[PDB]
Design an enzyme around this catalytic site. Structure first.
Site: not given
Length: 280
Positions: A203-204
């Site tokens: 995702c991040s």
């Protein structure tokens, strides 16, 4: 050997690697780092440069052992930092990963999420000793399928960048199944390359949409090859994933989304048996 065996229960809660001072830039949050024991080590790097072999990413699998070949494995990863896109590709290349899941639009709510590590369509760009060309997108409602073609000595490895843009970091999808319909395709493309190494999910920060995504997928895979009637210990699955990359199912709506994900996959995959009645 012998009965002489250091019962190493939870042989790793460790996380010193991403604490090295040199990695500071290579991490997006302070508390969210990878267990040195499940951390994916960058190869190639110089044994004599501080945190050269580092990346905030970890390997993952039901448990270290068991069923089928070594059951399906992923890599829980941290959305690329401009300062670290060169080595994501180091691990993607090195891990023979052939499929990629990015569950975040680069930026959401003005707040950066991940940094591009792919060239624009029809264009090429090299990230280190690797030159990837974005051969052409396939943009479905819930996603965009890029078709990078990385290269070592032109030895085209084709990788698939599935990016999910409809599932917002600020909250799980509603009454969705587009992450199920999105996980199917992702699943059949991997089901199309045995030599394929570890799917790379991210995702991040890599422990929320990432960890959710991976747990659902771990549940759907288990029920498929074992039966829609077998036991499903989501709380257990979760800790067995967090024992790998802590935090994984990060927030409330997510843990509760794995439930909404599973139960539909279960009915979906169970009304599919028009192939049978089973009404003796």
């Amino acid at each position: 050997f012998e009965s002489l065996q250091k019962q190493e229960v939870k042989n790793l809660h460790q996380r010193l690697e991403g604490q090295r001072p040199e990695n500071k830039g290579k991490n997006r949050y302070k508390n969210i780092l990878p267990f040195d024991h499940s951390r994916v080590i960058l190869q190639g790097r110089d044994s004599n440069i501080p945190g050269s072999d580092y990346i905030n990413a970890n390997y993952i699998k039901n448990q270290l052992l068991g069923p089928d070949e070594n059951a399906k494995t992923y890599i829980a990863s941290q959305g690329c930092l401009e300062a670290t896109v060169n080595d994501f590709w180091q691990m993607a290349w090195q891990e023979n990963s052939r499929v990629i899941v990015m569950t975040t639009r680069e930026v959401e709510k003005g707040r950066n999420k991940c940094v591009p590590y792919w060239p624009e369509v029809g264009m090429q760009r090299a990230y280190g000793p690797y030159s990837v060309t974005n051969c052409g997108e396939h943009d479905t409602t819930e996603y965009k399928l890029r078709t990078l073609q990385v290269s070592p000595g032109d030895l085209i490895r084709e990788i698939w960048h599935y990016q999910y843009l409809s599932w917002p970091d600020h909250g799980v999808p509603s009454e969705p199944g587009g992450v199920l319909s999105f996980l199917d395709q992702i699943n059949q493309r991997q089901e199309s390359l045995p030599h394929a190494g570890p799917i790379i999910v991210h995702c991040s920060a890599g422990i929320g949409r990432t960890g959710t995504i991976i747990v659902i997928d771990m549940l759907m895979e288990n029920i498929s090859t074992k039966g829609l009637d077998c036991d499903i210990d989501i709380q257990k699955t979760i800790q067995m994933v967090r024992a790998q990359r802590s935090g994984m199912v990060q927030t409330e709506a997510q843990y509760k989304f794995i439930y909404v994900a599973i139960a539909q996959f279960i009915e979906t995959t169970k009304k599919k048996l028009e192939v049978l009645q089973s009404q003796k």
